[PDB]
């Protein structure tokens, strides 16, 4: 029997059971240590509407609040939504996160 991954595709070490979590898209049961977790921080307002809201606001310099969403995906939904991609035999050993913009300034 060939073992594709040393970790069996999850973060279970020294533990017997792990509570399941529901996938955000398909409601499927997935172990918390197998679920693909994406933290999404977004402004409540889209970048285009920021000007119109600042002009109509009673306050000269209102700091817009942020949405904090912890998305939990099953492996199928994460592949379908292209959040995770297929990797070569060697590139599966790599655990570095892909570089994003750089940083949270301005355009991104």
């Amino acid at each position: 029997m060939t073992k594709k991954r040393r970790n069996n595709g999850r973060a279970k070490k020294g533990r017997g059971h792990v509570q399941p979590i529901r996938c955000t898209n398909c409601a499927c049961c997935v172990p918390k240590d197998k679920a693909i977790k994406k933290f999404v921080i977004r402004n409540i307002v889209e970048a285009a509407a920021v000007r119109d809201i600042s002009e109509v606001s009673v306050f000269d310099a209102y700091v817009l609040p942020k949405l904090y969403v912890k998305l939990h995906y099953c492996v199928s939904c994460a592949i379908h939504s292209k959040v995770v991609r297929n990797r070569s035999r060697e590139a599966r050993k790599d655990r570095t996160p892909p570089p994003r913009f750089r940083p949270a300034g301005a355009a991104p």
């Binding site: 307002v45 509407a49 009673v58 209102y62």
Partner: protein
């Protein structure tokens, strides 16, 4: 329509209660207290197709009317409260959240504040769909 006897240098502040997500958009303008309220318009009233009720322009066309009746009465400014469905569901805004704001602001109404309000459990009852969930 009779407004208050001064609003010349001040503003009168209503609460907008924008609803978010799919197959539906509400905009429901109320008092500060929220005890009593004014006109309430849906995207299912602007557009009939049973599939464009969550669309951007249906949400914009809604707020483009609601914002008229506000200023007609004397309500000139708006604090904003959001609502995504939540309750162990999607808990993420629909399309028609960004949309209605851009339309109602530029119609002429003032924006005072904005915030997120969503009903988020501290862990509660099992979600519809079963163990294997929806597929197809």
């Amino acid at each position: 329509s009779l407004g208050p006897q001064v609003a010349e240098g001040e503003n009168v502040f209503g609460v907008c209660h924008i609803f978010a997500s799919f197959n539906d958009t509400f905009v429901h303008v109320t008092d500060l207290s929220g005890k009593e309220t004014i006109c309430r318009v849906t995207g299912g009233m602007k557009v009939k197709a049973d599939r464009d009720e969550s669309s951007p322009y249906a949400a914009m066309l809604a707020a483009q009317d609601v914002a008229q009746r506000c200023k007609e009465l004397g309500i000139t400014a708006l604090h904003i409260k959001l609502r995504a469905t939540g309750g162990n569901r999607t808990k993420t805004p629909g399309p028609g959240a960004q949309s209605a704001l851009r339309a109602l602001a530029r119609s002429g109404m003032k924006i005072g504040r904005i915030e997120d309000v969503t009903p988020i459990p501290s862990d509660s009852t099992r979600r519809k769909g079963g163990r294997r969930g929806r597929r197809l």
